[PDB]
Amino acid sequence: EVPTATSVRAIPAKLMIDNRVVINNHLKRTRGGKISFTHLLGYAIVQAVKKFPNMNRHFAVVDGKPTAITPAHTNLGLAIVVAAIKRCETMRFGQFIAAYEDIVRRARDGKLTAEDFSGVTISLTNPMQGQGAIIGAGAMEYPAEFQGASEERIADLGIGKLITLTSTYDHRIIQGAESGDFLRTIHQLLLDDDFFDEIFRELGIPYEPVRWRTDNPDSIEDKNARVIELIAAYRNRGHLMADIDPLRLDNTRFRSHPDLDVNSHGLTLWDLDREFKVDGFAGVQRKKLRDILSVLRDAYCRHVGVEYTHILEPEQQRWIQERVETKHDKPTVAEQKYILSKLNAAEAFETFLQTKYVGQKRFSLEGAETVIPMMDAVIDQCAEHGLDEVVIAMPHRGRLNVLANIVGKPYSQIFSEFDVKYHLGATGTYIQMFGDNDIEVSLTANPSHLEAVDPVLEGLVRAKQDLLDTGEEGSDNRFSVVPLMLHGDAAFAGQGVVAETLNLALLRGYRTGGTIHIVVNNQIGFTTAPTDSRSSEYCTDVAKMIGAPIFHVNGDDPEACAWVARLAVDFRQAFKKDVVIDMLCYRRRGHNEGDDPSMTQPYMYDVIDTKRGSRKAYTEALIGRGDISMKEAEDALRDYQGQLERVFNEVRELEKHELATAVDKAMLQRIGDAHLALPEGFTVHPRVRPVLEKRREMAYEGRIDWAFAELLALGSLIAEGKLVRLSGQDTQRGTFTQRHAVIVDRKTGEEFTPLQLLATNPDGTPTGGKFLVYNSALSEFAAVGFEYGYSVGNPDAMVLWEAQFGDFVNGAQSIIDEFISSGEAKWGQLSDVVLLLPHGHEGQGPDHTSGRIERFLQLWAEGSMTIAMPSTPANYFHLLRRHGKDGIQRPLIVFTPKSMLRNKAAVSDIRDFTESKFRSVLEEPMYTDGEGDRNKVTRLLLTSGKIYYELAARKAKENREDVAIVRIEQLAPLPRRRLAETLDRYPNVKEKFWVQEEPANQGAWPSFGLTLPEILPDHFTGLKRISRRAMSAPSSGSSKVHAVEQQEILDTAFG
Amino acid sequence: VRAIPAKLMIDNRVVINNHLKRTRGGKISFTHLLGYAIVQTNLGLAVVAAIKRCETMRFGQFIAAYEDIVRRARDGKLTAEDFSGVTISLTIGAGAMESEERIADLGIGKLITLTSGAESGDFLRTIHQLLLDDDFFDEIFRELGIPYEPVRWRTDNPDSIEDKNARVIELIAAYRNRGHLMADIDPLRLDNTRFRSHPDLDVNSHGLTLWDLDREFKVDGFAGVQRKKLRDILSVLRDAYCRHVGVEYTHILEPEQQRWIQERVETKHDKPTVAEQKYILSKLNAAEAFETFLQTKYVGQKRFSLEGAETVIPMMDAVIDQCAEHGLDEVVIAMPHRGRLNVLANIVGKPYSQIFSDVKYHLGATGTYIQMFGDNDIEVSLTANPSHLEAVDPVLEGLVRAKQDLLDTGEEGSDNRFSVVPLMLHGDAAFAGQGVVAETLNLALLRGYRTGGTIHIVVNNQIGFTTAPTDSRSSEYCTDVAKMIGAPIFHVNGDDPEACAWVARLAVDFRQAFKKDVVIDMLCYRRRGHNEGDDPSMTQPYMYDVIDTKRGSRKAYTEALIGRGDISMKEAEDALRDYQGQLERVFNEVRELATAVDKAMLQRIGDAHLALPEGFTVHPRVRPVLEKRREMAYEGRIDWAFAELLALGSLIAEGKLVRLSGQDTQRGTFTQRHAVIVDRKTGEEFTPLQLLATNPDGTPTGGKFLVYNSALSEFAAVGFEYGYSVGNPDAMVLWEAQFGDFVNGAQSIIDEFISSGEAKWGQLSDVVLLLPHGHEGQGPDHTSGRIERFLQLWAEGSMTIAMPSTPANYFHLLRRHGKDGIQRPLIVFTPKSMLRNKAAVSDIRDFTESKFRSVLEEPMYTDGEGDRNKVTRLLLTSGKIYYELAARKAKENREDVAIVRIEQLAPLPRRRLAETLDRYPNVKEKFWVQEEPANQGAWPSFGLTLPEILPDHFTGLKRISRRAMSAPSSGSSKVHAVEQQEILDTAFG
């Protein structure tokens, strides 16, 4: 009928085979689907028809005359009977395979119409009127004489397989020279760089296709060296080219890496089946370059970027390498349906939050909902290790979602009177889905000050660990309480408390055996772009400081996110070291209500408007991969709607409804004798020995100094079964060489803690007490935060933090302002933390003088904190004992001495410790013990602290019976009743003065000057002030000035 | 006769002499090794002189005795006693060691033949056994102070060259990545285990032996893959990564930077010239003499001794010299107190007369540095700082950035030289523990904060007062935080001043090449206690037993120069003579002792908002704002946001530099500023106020608008801006809080620098802190800038504290600030919802015919027809609450109530206030009205000071506020609303 002729061509299929492997490897790992050789051959024909429109024509007799007809389109016929893919000439690869699979998913489903069989112009068959040519495709074969040759002879010799293409053409309208060029052009296309560049583009494959190049003539040994160079480059910096960004904002990311490029390493497609020696665990092993490269891609350049070759410990690097480079089994369909059920719950909660309430756009997890399945994997993996509890600290973003879907709190409890709910703590229990374990989950309170909670969490976890006898101060080394700390990308990079907290990771006094860090990196900080937020590649680069492994993961891949979360928990359990997970995601909405984020970030938000949610993309991925059926997916949408329904239904229902501190002589003597009950063969430093000896003397003979009075209070608490945690900068010895809580053996360096002996009763039995004394790192913010957190974690522990000088505590202002002074009023979170602040005007300058009493007195409100400035060692002793034993959890701020530690007048009698209590107001001993007349007094000086001793000395020298000195030991809360009882004893006073060392604008005057004549107007109306002049600094810089100012105060007081 | 393999002998001698040439000096002969082996009792040495009592000699003593006999044969001073008393002798004969490339591969070594019956043949066998013995070469090395493991006599690995080459390449990577973990960087050598601990760096655990040393291996590089001898490979690796310099660089993500370091560190360095060594030693002499003087002539000056860290002086000298070599303009130094006066004398170059005439450890200085060998000059300056360690780090950065911008260098300059260099010193404990370090390091490459690289020197004395490094950091080095910005780290032996100078110059070269920070960890020690009376052996007895055996850097360096044969004994005597002279002159020198603008200006700033670049696409929500601004500039009703840009714009137009920055400051936290507008289609930025930097005639005004979005930090950002105003006193510098509630994260900068720098150091700053403040029901962290705290820090003329209630009063406040010729910080409590209040708007005449009013009256009494005589109750207030009290007064129509605003809280406008109150003669009660709790806002201050400062007006002043609270406000909006109505009701009750 059609006089036909044939033209045959043997085409190399090596690039075709190789790129199909890359394409289907990708699809398998991503959204699913399988590209056939027919897809590639069919599309090539359609492109070759563009260079040769005559191969598309067909013979006809139109008006008795032989004619060649130019059809309107390229309608490629395919043997399925031949069905037509219409209008192929205006199709991109993606459109063509969609059209190809449309006809195919209808031949199988029996939904093909007569229209699908008409109008074919060219066709393809896989072993004629109205069509000019039929292209035939043979099976992939080796050239004759190479059939039966070893798979390694084929590899060594560089022999590839061949497709024989045939072209049966109408010789009335097509020339044999043209037909041959058509096949030569399909040959060229199926070896062409740009051809495979488009196929990859159109399938979303970010990797460079396998390239048709000439086989490198170098030896296997020389190439092997380059393979090993390439393995090291992926391991070290493969993370720089990983497909971690769900938005793919930076196109350039997947190129211009000569270090990871196979082609710039003298390797070609011809080496893919060649075997190369690679060193590892089982020693040297021979592997196919193809396998080497696919493992490297899967491990370092897909949805997970691994940073680990910065870790100085080789064992840890091998550990990560082994787990990340092994062929790890795909999750079970039950495991995938579980991850999807979590995404359903996360997305339903988010949808509800933004629908049912206004002003919730700032807490939106929309674009970051994978954090919920990720956090679930973390907590489940901790339960798998049989751990006790997971304590979470996080900012406001997604917090109520974490309460519902992670802490497991009911909607009735979360939304009762729906804000402060984004700052309060919670406790729940997590039950394993597949496993048989349960774990406690708790969330800690936090302010709006980003990252400020980081050290608080650590302190709180450490207190729980110590109680559970786990970790550092525990019999086991499990650290069965896990810190899970969330962060945002901008705050993690810019806030210093992060480096300060990371620095505590492995310290004896602060370690919690590793923290799991999750950074919700939405690549934005309110209005700010990452280039204005950090001077480094990743927001997590600060974690490299402690050599922590960093995992950058694609927030659109909840399988990779869960896998990484579990790996993180396993590393932490293995090395007791912090792990950071950088979850790359996006913020779908504006920062707050009304905000149009395209005002400042138009590019990012044009891209975000084209993004479908994690849940819909994950469901589609599962379908396309053949992991779930359409029915299984319909059930998933049914589950999402059910979740969305019960959250609306549950909140709808709720809206329809809604004191003796004295000790015995035996106790004093026991604490004193402990200082000499040295271990066998212990060599005390010759300068330390007189101190131990003076302490035994003091405990028996009196004249107790401040430093010993402190150890007497702490020692007696330990003896009574209390945990005592003391720490600060150089706190083991004391800044002023006064504590000696820990004494070092002069010859061996062995440490001895005398107060630890009090943890054992005289009969040998433990008391239950403990003395935990540490030298802190050189930080104020993290240390103060840690101790605050510790008291919250263990309310029965006596927790003390000591400033080197009270002048440096301003470095912890966020903690004081946001947690210590206000946590009870704001969150109902109680703390019994003690801040020891060395204070006193001694002529050492503006940074060695003041603890800023005036600032604490300003933060104070009825029952928030206790503020005291004791003038005697025994009053300090009773203050600490009262604090530890009152059953009240309220912070105590103490203004402690420096030179008054060695003042021989500031000493206490044994009866002051055994027959007294804390005195909030103190009188001169001459009126309470001696033979002094209070009626002779006409001038009353009210003071606090060390200046009492100078005013007392002056009164004694001049012998002034008309002047009395009254001390306010407890500055806040004011001892109104005790102060009134005292002043009533001086009936002939004609003038009262508040006397202080500090500038007029500092100390207690700004407070007392205003409140004392208000609180007690019958006693203090007309109260005058004697102080230093108001200053913009805590003191003068000159010692000589200080001395003149100090004498001015005493002269005025007695003038 | 006996033929012996002397391969281990040759190999270890190469290692021995390679070590000695670099360190202490001297050359070990084969005769030293053979002679000592024989001994293992007087050994005769051939003309045959004896070494007596060899049996009680260690290797070092034997070589000393051996060379003591050589210095008697050469010097002709041998006595008869030196020839009488011998036991055994050596000349025992000794034969010479006999293709050069074909022999290396077969594993054949050189043979040495020995001579002299059975016990004689056994003695040559005991000699044989010793030259291939571990413990022998182990003790020889320990005696010569060599910290490395000797070459071992092991059996040749039977594996192929290709297989070994792979293990060689693994080993090269191991040294490059982790070799620093094995470097001789500790002058005290406290950790013995250091040179054994690593199988990763061990040649023997890599299937390589001494038999592979002369075997060639293929190694890739810059000029391509080249064949090198394993011994050459290993010696280069050791010299580069395991001697006195530990290099950390493989963590750097930029390859061109890693190659750069690799090339400079792995090339064969030429030894310094004797002039260069005598110069380094002259600097150590000056440093040690100054220290000796300081501890002799003064007591209490032990707190800041550099004793054990004096190499920091030659190191810092190399840094500054290298900056002068690059022809840079200035080096600005920030450092703690340790060694500060030494830096003043020997680095800043201040005379002893100026230094010694304490506060001196906190004040700034300026000097000029002149090159020794070079022909250049460079300015050297030191900045003021508190005792708060590391807090100056951001201040230095801000101060360098201000100087760079003035010099038209770097980021806001025509050149990319960054000709002003930050040189920041630190201590090991503070660098690791203080967060402001990470916050400052984070600014390194930001557009708004970059200074083109900071040189960091960490004076690492391996102690932090009484605290040991294990209690101070959770990482290997105190410098590990620098890895955050991918900065190269160099760990250097403080006892080797040549390596310290070399590293300093390399650091300056890297910084100039990549405009990125470089950290030098100088390992040293603290010879004395932390301060005075301190016996450091109470807490660190081990470290201090070791330190008591250490001879100083100067004696150590002079002895090494002698040993190496770099200087003669006379040249060393001159060096002690120089030290003595330096010590003498230091003792001898000290012994001798209108804001209004015109309509044209307003209109120009307004028109600028629409003078868009050609083809610019404004966001549709931004366009109405630009249009309203042109309208406001011509028609009035000027809002707060525009009033601010009117003040800044007019300053730029008058030739002033204006630097504005904070979190999301380009747009504004409340979408109100729009200082920078982003092109909807291209992302291109447009800054309308920059147009004002050019006069109508086209000429530049000299002004500039530098507006930035800060990083998410308060401490570093506030510090940076404080520093900026100090570096450029003629610049208008503003820092904006997101909410005034977050500025407490910058408390150290407020307390130590801003509020007190003038009183303490004489250091003036004109910095402006913008703190969004107000009770609006948003919670305790979105309400207060803590007015009460600033008012407490204030003392006559330290700062200005204001809370303006109108856009024009804010405008005049900023203009007064920028134009008063006074350098004093300004704290402004700015609005949030009052930005959009239609009543809080200003008229054009308020900008053109007025000035800043510190005290404001109700417009009805100053413009309207209101009677002040009708008033019996006076309400004193400040800020937004005025509008609610005014609305309430208007509603109820209350002529008997007057509202007076205190716009300037500090310093109190005593005269303006009295003048005003005197106009209300029938007032029967005065109240201070505030939104804040009783213990906060201005009441704690005003309640005490107003009845003191003006007793005839304010005795009897009562308060109307919220109750005292432990937080700035309630957490509930509903509570806030009830409390807010309570205030208004009480005020009008």
Ligand SMILES: [Ca+2]
């Ligand atoms: Ca308590």
Ligand SMILES: [Ca+2]
């Ligand atoms: Ca000014």
Ligand SMILES: [Mg+2]
């Ligand atoms: Mg973010």
Ligand SMILES: [Mg+2]
């Ligand atoms: Mg130190």
